[PDB]
């Protein structure tokens, strides 16, 4: 398709030509055309074999979780909120223009809930989502019991050597290791049936109520409402809470008046955000804002008015790399036994990581690509009565030890922190570290923080965090875990990874793999599992230089950590990802081998490159355990790219000619108000980041058959940007030129940006030239000027006598391209703009010529050029030459 589609708002999509003009009548209310009510908006859209596929979701959607009976999750039929999300396939029915017409429609239903899932969901509790305005101090939580307060109790410290063997903690040198963090304060946790508040606390160490629903509505809510009142078209203090209602509206939180709808409705709304199409499937996943606990796998072959069922992430096993890497995640999901009446959590019911913050989803060839962060999910003790971990989340640093052999496989499979706590704070001679030094009796036993005694008489249930952090523990290991600051003291000095905090996840899912996820989703009775083995994990912290004044040699923790983050987030500890796209590399490969492809995704302070073997559509790898999985490469941002507000991400396109990704950011996406209820005024403008591959690419030649280096990428603030204008769209015409449509007032203006040695700058003269289009689809040809089409000077008729061409014939001259090229002088409008003449016998004696001329997009245009089958009628000149012979 030689046209470009452009979402002009929540409902309408319009086709643009490469001249930044709308195709007449192509502007389409797709919501209306999908026969859906006006509460529906477009969430994502895609081209697949020339048809348009659109994901719609409703602002009216309301969802219930009744934790008793069956079919536990369902839409609120009463009022009207049975407004499920739909995927729709449109085709173009005209040959002249764009008339879209609906072909298939798919309702995305609410998940089945096996009896066995529902016991976890009874007591599942979820953190309020991270916003733009959430502070490191907001996220901090009160430090929980030490490893020996839980096991031994209130007797003494100096039993720890004699007493640890009976609690299966042999040789563990960490009685003073945290078992996580208190839920009596901090960010709010809520069950699927309750609601999150609009207030976040500035110091969650002191001002949350945490999971104490009761306490909130009884005590703390009127206090926070006193401190942080909603603007009205009072203004108050903000000593203790931010009011983030508007920043919540911003990331897709839904409301009745000033109250957010229940968690289950926010999970559903946020879970229908991204789509991707194959010949056989539509897959639908969630946004990078909320954790998503399920995805949909629609079979294109599905019947009308059917009910496409989502698959639980809890039912979907990934390869985390090595096997120990997966066990780290599951061991911290909750307490496991076959002694515990009603101690029901994801780990005890034999489920796996239940929640991802999805970066996005795409299809290449016939494969779904995805990436994301593991959303923190752990045990919390929910008992009453006098249980010592009561009201406490059970979490700990799983960060490698210092003495761990350097070499990737050896680092991520180090046994340090596998079964319970060991990390905290240590000093050897006068060298300090948060990480355990070691890793003669036997082994160094880690064990889950539940006193063997009270084992049947404890209540460990599941929680899900709003970020990629397991432990909010207001201690030093927390900051080094999240920021990437645990290093060993050896020859090379190597960064020691977490296998629980800040874990990035990516993969390629095959059609058979999809067919199981659907099979899991329709299973009646018991949970059916699904293996995605084309997948990997990676420790991916936020860059430390997004913070200040951190101490190493009072040691800095989350509650005191100064953020200087420039990427539109107040916090400097939680990582974020957005806009995963794939593309096929257009740079041919040694034949005998299939097109190379990859994907990129932005993360805090860097681009990441996903690498694949197109042979067997797998992840790239190398024989060597030592070196780090070559499926992943991270390239840090420079100051210019770090300045971009990631929370304003709008769109990402690939272009197979350039082999370049364009990330568009639109500042109109900022919330109306700050957490201090101050109006936001830097909401004008936009920014484009350009990504391109680097490194030696697979199968360029005999030597590159294999690789022990990961192909990387590079993000560049391209130079296309504005703080003044309202974006409408960015047409990436070619490697050399981009077109921005925008308003300054209320009428659209076209700017052309030109690529100068890899930096794009506005060409005021090309812009005014392309804009001069007389209300037509394409820019005017102008006889005495060098406008968008350049300037064409025809030879005088007397060039024929001059060059003895009178002796040649129309029919001869027409099959001599290089002779009629000498019938004009072209002055181009941009470097290496080309132009040919096209002849046409008019008589026995005469021909005429009309030029074929390159535009910004690389393509030639002439008198018969069409876009979407609609004649452009560009108005190039013509010329008759006469006095040729008839031999
Ligand atoms: K593996
Ligand atoms: K250039």
From Swiss-Prot:
Q: Name one GO cellular component term.
A: plasma membrane
Q: Where in the cell does this protein reside?
A: Cell membrane
**Keyword Ubl conjugation appears in the UniProt entry:** no
Task: Return the Basic and acidic residues bias intervals.
Answer: 140-151
Q: Which GO terms describe its biological process?
A: cell adhesion
Q: Where is the composition biased (Polar residues)?
A: 155-183
What UniProt keywords apply to this chain's record, in alphabetical order?
Cell adhesion, Cell membrane, Membrane, Signal, Transmembrane, Transmembrane helix
Q: Region labeled Disordered — which residues?
A: 138-183, 200-234
Stated membrane topology is: Single-pass membrane protein
Knockout or disruption consequences: Probably essential, it was not disrupted in a global transposon mutagenesis study.
Q: What is its main location?
A: membrane
Protein's name in the database = Mgp-operon protein 3
């Amino acid at each position: 398709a030689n046209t470009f589609l452009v979402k002009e708002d929540s409902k309408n999509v319009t086709a643009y030509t490469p001249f930044a003009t709308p195709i007449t009548d192509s502007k389409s209310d797709l919501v209306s055309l999908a026969q859906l009510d006006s509460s529906y908006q477009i969430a994502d859209q895609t081209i697949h074999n020339t048809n348009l596929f659109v994901l719609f979701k409703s602002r009216d959607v309301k969802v219930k979780y009744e934790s008793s009976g069956s079919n536990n999750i369902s839409f609120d039929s009463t009022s009207q909120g049975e407004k499920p999300s739909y995927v729709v396939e449109f085709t173009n029915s005209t040959n002249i223009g764009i008339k879209w017409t609906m072909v298939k429609k798919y309702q995305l239903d609410v998940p089945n809930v096996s009896s066995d899932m529902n016991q976890v969901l009874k007591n599942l509790i979820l953190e309020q989502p991270l916003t733009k305005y959430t502070l490191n101090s907001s996220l901090a939580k009160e430090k929980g019991k030490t490893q020996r307060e839980v096991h031994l109790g209130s007797g003494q410290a100096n039993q720890w050597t004699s007493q640890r063997n009976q609690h299966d903690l042999n040789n563990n040198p960490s009685p003073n290791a945290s078992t996580g963090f208190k839920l009596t304060t901090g960010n709010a946790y809520r069950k699927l049936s309750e609601s999150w508040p609009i207030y976040e606390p500035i110091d969650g160490t002191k001002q949350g109520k945490g999971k104490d629903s009761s306490g909130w509505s009884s005590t703390e809510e009127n206090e926070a409402k006193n401190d942080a009142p909603s603007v009205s078209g009072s203004s108050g203090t903000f000593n203790k809470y931010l009011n983030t209602k508007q920043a919540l509206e911003s990331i897709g939180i839904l409301f009745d008046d000033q109250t957010p709808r229940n968690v289950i409705t926010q999970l559903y709304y946020a879970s229908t955000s991204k789509l991707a199409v194959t010949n056989n499937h539509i897959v639908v996943m969630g946004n990078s804002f909320l954790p998503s606990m399920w995805y949909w796998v629609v079979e294109r072959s599905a019947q009308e008015n059917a009910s496409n069922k989502p698959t639980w992430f809890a039912n979907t096993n990934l390869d985390w790399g090595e096997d120990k890497q997966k066990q780290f995640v599951e061991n911290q999901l909750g307490y496991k036994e076959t002694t515990s009446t009603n101690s029901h959590n994801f780990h005890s019911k034999s489920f796996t990581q239940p929640a991802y913050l999805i970066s996005g989803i795409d299809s290449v060839n016939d494969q779904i690509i995805f990436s994301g962060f593991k959303a923190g999910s752990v045990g919390y003790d929910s008992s009453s009565s006098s249980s010592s971990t009561k009201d406490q989340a059970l979490a700990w640093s799983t960060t490698t030890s210092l003495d761990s052999k350097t070499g990737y496989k050896d680092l991520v499979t180090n046994d340090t922190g596998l079964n319970g706590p060991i990390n905290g704070s240590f000093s050897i001679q006068d060298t300090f570290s948060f990480v355990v030094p070691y890793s003669t009796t036997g082994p160094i036993k880690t064990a889950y923080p539940v006193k063997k005694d009270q084992k049947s008489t404890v209540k460990i249930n599941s929680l899900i965090n709003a970020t990629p952090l397991n432990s909010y523990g207001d201690e030093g290991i927390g900051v080094f875990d999240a920021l990437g600051l645990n290093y060993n003291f050896k020859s090379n000095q190597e960064r020691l990874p977490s296998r629980t905090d800040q874990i990035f996840v990516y993969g390629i899912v095959s059609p058979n793999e999809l067919r199981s996820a659907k099979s899991s989703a329709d299973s009646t009775g018991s949970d059916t599992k699904v293996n995605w083995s084309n997948t990997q994990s990676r420790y991916l912290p936020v860059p430390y230089n997004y913070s200040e004044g951190i101490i190493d040699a009072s040691v800095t923790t989350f509650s005191g950590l100064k953020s200087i983050a420039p990427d539109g987030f107040a916090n400097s500890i939680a990582n974020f990802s957005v806009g995963l796209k794939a593309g096929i590399d257009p740079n041919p490969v040694m034949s005998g081998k299939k097109a190379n492809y990859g994907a990129v995704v932005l993360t805090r302070g860097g681009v990441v490159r996903l690498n694949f073997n197109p042979g067997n559509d797998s992840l790239l790898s190398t024989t060597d355990n030592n070196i780090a999985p070559i499926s992943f490469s991270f390239t840090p941002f420079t100051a210019a790219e770090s300045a971009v507000d990631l929370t304003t991400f709008k769109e990402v396109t690939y272009n197979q000619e350039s082999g370049l990704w364009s990330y568009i950011f639109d500042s109109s996406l900022k919330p109306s108000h700050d957490g201090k209820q101050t109006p936001v005024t830097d909401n004008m403008g936009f920014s484009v980041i350009t990504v391109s591959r680097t490194g030696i690419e697979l199968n360029q030649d005999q030597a590159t058959t294999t690789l022990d280096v990961a192909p990387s990428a590079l993000a560049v603030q391209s130079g296309i940007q504005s703080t003044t204008q309202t974006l409408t769209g960015v047409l990436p015409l070619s490697e050399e030129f981009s077109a921005v449509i925008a308003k300054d007032s209320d009428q659209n203006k076209i700017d052309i940006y030109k690529n100068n040695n890899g930096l794009f700058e506005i060409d005021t003269q090309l812009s005014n030239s392309v804009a001069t289009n007389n209300g037509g689809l394409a820019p005017s040809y102008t006889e005495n000027r060098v406008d968008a089409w350049g300037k064409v000077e025809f030879a005088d008729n007397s060039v024929l006598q001059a060059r003895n061409l009178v002796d040649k014939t129309v029919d001869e001259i027409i099959n001599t391209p290089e002779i009629l090229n000498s019938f004009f002088r072209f002055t181009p409008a941009f470097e290496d703009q080309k132009a040919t003449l096209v002849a046409t016998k008019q008589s026995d004696t005469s021909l005429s010529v009309s030029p074929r001329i390159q535009f910004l997009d690389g393509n030639f245009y002439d008198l018969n050029s069409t876009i979407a089958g609609v004649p452009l009628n560009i108005g190039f000149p013509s010329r008759v030459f006469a006095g040729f012979a008839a031999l």
